[PDB]
Structures are given as C-alpha cells and as structure tokens.
Amino acid sequence: ITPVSEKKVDDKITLYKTTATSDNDKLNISQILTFNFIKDKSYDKDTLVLKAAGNINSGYKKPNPKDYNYSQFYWGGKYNVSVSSESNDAVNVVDYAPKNQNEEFQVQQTLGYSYGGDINISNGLSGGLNGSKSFSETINYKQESYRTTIDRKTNHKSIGWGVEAHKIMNNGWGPYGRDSYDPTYGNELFLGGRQSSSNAGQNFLPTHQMPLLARGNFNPEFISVLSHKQNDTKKSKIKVTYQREMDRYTNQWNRLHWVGNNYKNQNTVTFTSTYEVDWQNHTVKLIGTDSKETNP
Ligand code: NI
Numbered sequence: 001i002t003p004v005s006e007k008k009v010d011d012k013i014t015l016y017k018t019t020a021t022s023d024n025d026k027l028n029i030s031q032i033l034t035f036n037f038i039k040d041k042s043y044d045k046d047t048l049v050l051k052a053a054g055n056i057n058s059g060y061k062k063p064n065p066k067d068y069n070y071s072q073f074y075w076g077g078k079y080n081v082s083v084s085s086e087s088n089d090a091v092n093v094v095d096y097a098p099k100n101q102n103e104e105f106q107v108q109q110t111l112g113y114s115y116g117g118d119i120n121i122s123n124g125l126s127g128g129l130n131g132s133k134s135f136s137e138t139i140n141y142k143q144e145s146y147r148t149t150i151d152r153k154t155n156h157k158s159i160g161w162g163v164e165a166h167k168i169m170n171n172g173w174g175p176y177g178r179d180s181y182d183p184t185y186g187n188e189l190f191l192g193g194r195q196s197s198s199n200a201g202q203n204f205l206p207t208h209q210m211p212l213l214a215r216g217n218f219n220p221e222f223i224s225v226l227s228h229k230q231n232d233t234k235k236s237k238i239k240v241t242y243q244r245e246m247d248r249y250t251n252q253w254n255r256l257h258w259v260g261n262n263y264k265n266q267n268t269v270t271f272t273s274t275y276e277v278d279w280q281n282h283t284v285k286l287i288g289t290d291s292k293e294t295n296p
Contacts, residue, residue, distance in 0.1 A: 012115050013134050014039040016282030022273045024291045028057030029242050029271040037282040043117035046228040046279050049137050053221045059246045060215040067201035069253045075214045077178050077247035082160030083224040084239045090232035095119040095225035096159040103147040111223045112136045139221040145211040159224050170205050190249045191260035200251050228279045236277045243270040267295040
C-alpha cells in the first residue's frame with residue numbers, strides 16, 4: 001500500500017490517493033487497486049473512486065499432443081470482478097464503469113467527477129486526458145471475442161461484472177460460444193478439422209488463433225464509485241473479488257468424424273481481498289485475503 005498522497009486541487013476539491021496491491025502467485029491473479037477519495041467543499045458526501053486493475057490468468061495449459069483419439073484442455077471461459085461494501089449503512093455503491101453491456105474489442109471509458117458531486121461516464125479516453133472534470137479516472141481493456149455484462153445482483157452494496165467468451169471465430173468459421181451445439185459435430189469452438197488424420201491432442205485451433213482472454217490472461221480495468229455520509233465516523237470494509245471460470249474443451253474421434261464438447265466452469269478459481277476503509281483519514285488497510293479453487 002502506498003502512503004496516502006493529499007493534493008489540494010483548488011478551493012473546492014482535495015484528492016487523497018492510495019494504491020494497494022495483493023496477489024496470489026500460484027493462481028496468477030493480481031489486484032492493483034487505486035483508491036481516490038474526493039473531498040468536495042460543495043458536496044456533503046465523501047466520494048471514493050476505486051479503480052480495480054491487475055491480472056487474471058486464463059489458467060490455460062496446452063493439451064497433451066500425444067492424445068490420440070480423445071483430448072482436452074482447460075481455458076478461460078469467463079472472468080468475474082466484483083466490489084462490495086460491508087459493515088456500514090452510510091456507504092453505498094452509487095456509480096461504476098462500464099455501466100452497460102459491451103462486446104467491443106476494446107473497452108475505453110472515462111469516469112468524471114464534477115464539482116457538487118455529479119458523476120458522468122464518457123466513451124473514449126479523451127475525457128480523462130482533456131482534464132475538463134475536477135477529477136477523472138479511465139478504464140482501458142482488451143476483450144476481443146468476449147462480452148462484458150453487469151451482474152444482475154448489482155445493488156447499492158455491490159457492483160460486479162462478467163466478461164464471458166461470446167463470439168469466437170475458428171479459422172473463419174463461427175462465431176462460436178461456450179454453448180454452441182451442432183447435432184453431428186458438437187461444439188466446434190476450438191476443434192481443428194472435422195476429418196483430420198492428426199492426433200486428438202494436435203486437432204485443436206492453434207493456440208495463437210485462440211482469443212487472448214481464452215489462452216492468456218485478462219487485464220481488468222473497472223471503476224466503482226462509493227459514497228459515504230460525512231456525518232458518519234465509522235470505518236467500512238470493501239471486498240474485491242477476481243474470479244475465473246475454467247471451461248474444459250474436448251475432442252473425440254467417433255468412427256467417421258471428430259466431435260468437440262465444451263464443459264462450462266469445471267474449475268472456479270477465486271481470489272478476494274478485504275480492505276478496511278478509514279473515511280476520516282482517507283486510508284485503507286488490507287485485513288484479509290482468500291483464494292479458492294473448486295477443482296484443482
Ligand atoms: Ni453479442
């Protein structure tokens with residue numbers, strides 16, 4: 001955790017910034033969190049803009065190339081990120097970015113704070129480079145073939161996002177998804193050729209033609225905005241969760257042709273950090289982490 005930096009921006013706004021990192025290196029999940037507390041003389045709530053960045057590896061490993069009539073590998077089917085507030089009713093999640101479903105290859109947005117408390121989200125990064133807002137923070141991430149959606153359970157105490165395999169192209173064919181189904185060939189998502197004389201373990205889409213999120217890693221950038229009533233003097237807790245759902249893709253030779261299958265979320269890998277937030281001192285302390293895999 002960096003020591004807090006205090007910056008008087010002008011006679012209305014003072015900003016307090018801390019950066020905190022926590023990671024699990026066995027799971028290859030890293031959280032890089034930027035906490036910006038905004039003290040605005042003209043607004044009677046404290047505002048925290050929390051940017052969640054870092055890494056979630058897909059967990060992909062190559063299939064065994066010697067597998068002859070049946071093979072399989074695990075891949076990054078979906079990434080989940082959430083931020084939740086506990087232990088104080090005077091704290092609420094009030095805004096966040098991205099705000100709407102988005103399947104563009106790159107997500108690039110600015111979240112701006114205006115004197116008096118208004119939050120706006122604009123498309124593109126100019127909004128946080130033109131410096132027109134009293135405070136802004138940007139998100140910038142690649143998610144080619146994947147789709148970001150806001151979780152249905154999002155409410156005043158939690159925001160989460162799902163970044164899910166959505167429209168995957170396989171050597172010009174597709175698009176395919178985690179669920180695609182043909183009665184003859186199964187899910188052809190990462191199948192090499194329907195008739196290939198190759199080994200099962202060498203009858204998959206070559207790794208570099210898979211999406212980066214499927215075989216490599218996701219680099220999340222998400223913003224949560226939390227408000228805290230200035231009257232309240234109590235600390236609060238924030239839990240930040242990064243998660244991958246690992247799917248198992250398989251192929252099998254059935255007499256005349258290959259069949260592909262995708263099993264969803266066969267291993268769920270989760271990393272959570274919990275911070276104590278001091279609103280009076282604009283400081284955060286890491287009080288807990290936890291890691292889980294359902295099927296290592
Ligand atoms: Ni779509």
